[PDB]
């Protein structure tokens, strides 16, 4: 089997909603705030080592 | 000298290898052929 990590989606969706709310203070009330994947690097930076 | 670990390939693309090597032992003149397991990230191919 593969090594896997399980995180509850309700809690992660709820916390992620706390971080996105605060970020709007610096960049404006109504702006597109997207989250993306790792854009490159070694295996260390790219994954949750 | 590695042989992929016993697995049914449905893709399972196991990173694990099963490698036998000529390892040293307690005595200098003697040797031993032992095996081990290594993930894909630890070994590279030597042509």
């Amino acid at each position, epitope marked *: *089997r*593969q090594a*896997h990590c399980n995180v509850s989606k309700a809690t992660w969706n709820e916390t992620l909603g706390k971080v996105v709310k605060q970020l709007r203070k610096h960049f404006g009330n109504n702006t597109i705030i997207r989250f993306a994947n790792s854009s490159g690097g070694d295996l260390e930076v790219t994954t949750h080592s | 000298q590695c042989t992929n670990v*016993t*697995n*049914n*390939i*449905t893709d*399972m693309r196991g990173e694990l290898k099963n490698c036998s090597f000529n390892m040293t032992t307690e005595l200098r003149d003697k040797k031993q052929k032992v095996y081990s397991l290594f993930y894909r990230l630890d070994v590279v191919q030597i042509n």
Partner: antibody, heavy 132, light 108 residues
Framework: QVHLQESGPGLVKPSETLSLTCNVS????????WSWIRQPLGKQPEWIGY???????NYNPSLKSRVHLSLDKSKNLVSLRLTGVTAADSAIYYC??????????????????????????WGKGTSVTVSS | APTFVSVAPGQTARITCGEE??????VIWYQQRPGQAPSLIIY??????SGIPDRFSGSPGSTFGTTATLTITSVEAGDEADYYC????????????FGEGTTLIVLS
């Protein structure tokens, strides 16, 4: 009740195209899975691959190139075709309906499950011997 | 190739079939009476199909390092036949040839 009948010549010269037929009654030929199992005299059976609609068909790796299968909804039959038979093909060819199953030992997100097949209802079969 | 097991009438039978388990298995057992066609007994180990008595029991496929086992307690005369096992091992590739069957014979 399911009435399955296995018809075949029973005697075929070497290096000749063998063809059998499995009559089916009680249920449509397309709804259920079908498989062929041959058995040499004094040995263990041998799965000769299964067949089903929607392109679901796999072959035995040993005789994959020589074996063939087909189906037809109108006549409610199952057909087996084998080209280039030899003396090792002398076996009793059974025709049985097959059911699938899902056995899960892992998360299933990364294909940690596998499908197993079992045949519930069989038929009398036909005794086919290859000899010159 | 064949393996014979003698069992007195009305006593427990022990049937060995297949290699050692390397992964989680889905064992299938079949009954081939003399001259007749192979009939299904057990699918997915202890789980059985309609019309089968409870005397037939399959060893669980969750453990590793052991071989499959079909247990028949208080064997009746009709249970005597040839028994084949179909191994579905997660570590092993697809098996297209059944295992070497075991020939159960009541002394009679």
């Amino acid at each position: 009740q399911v009435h399955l009948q296995e018809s075949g010549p029973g005697l075929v010269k070497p290096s000749e195209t063998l063809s059998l037929t499995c009559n089916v009654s009680g249920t449509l030929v397309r709804d259920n899975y079908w498989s062929w199992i041959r058995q040499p005299l004094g040995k263990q059976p041998e799965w000769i691959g299964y067949v089903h609609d929607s392109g679901d068909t796999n072959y035995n790796p040993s005789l994959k190139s020589r074996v063939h299968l087909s189906l037809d909804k109108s006549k409610n039959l199952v057909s087996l075709r084998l080209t280039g038979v030899t003396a090792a093909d002398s076996a009793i060819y059974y025709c049985a309906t097959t059911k699938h199953g899902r056995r899960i030992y892992g998360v299933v997100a990364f294909k940690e499950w596998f499908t197993y097949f079992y045949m519930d209802v069989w038929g009398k079969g036909t005794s086919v011997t290859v000899s010159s | 190739a064949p393996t014979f097991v003698s069992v007195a009438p009305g006593q427990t039978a022990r049937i060995t079939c297949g290699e050692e388990s390397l992964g989680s298995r889905s064992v299938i057992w079949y009954q081939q009476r003399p001259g007749q066609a192979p009939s299904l007994i057990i699918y997915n180990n202890n789980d059985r199909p309609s019309g089968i008595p409870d005397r037939f029991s399959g060893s669980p496929g969750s453990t590793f390092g052991t071989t499959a086992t079909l247990t028949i307690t208080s064997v009746e005369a009709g249970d005597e036949a040839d028994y084949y096992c179909h191994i579905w091992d997660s570590r092993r590739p697809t098996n297209w040839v059944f295992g070497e069957g075991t020939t159960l014979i009541v002394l009679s």
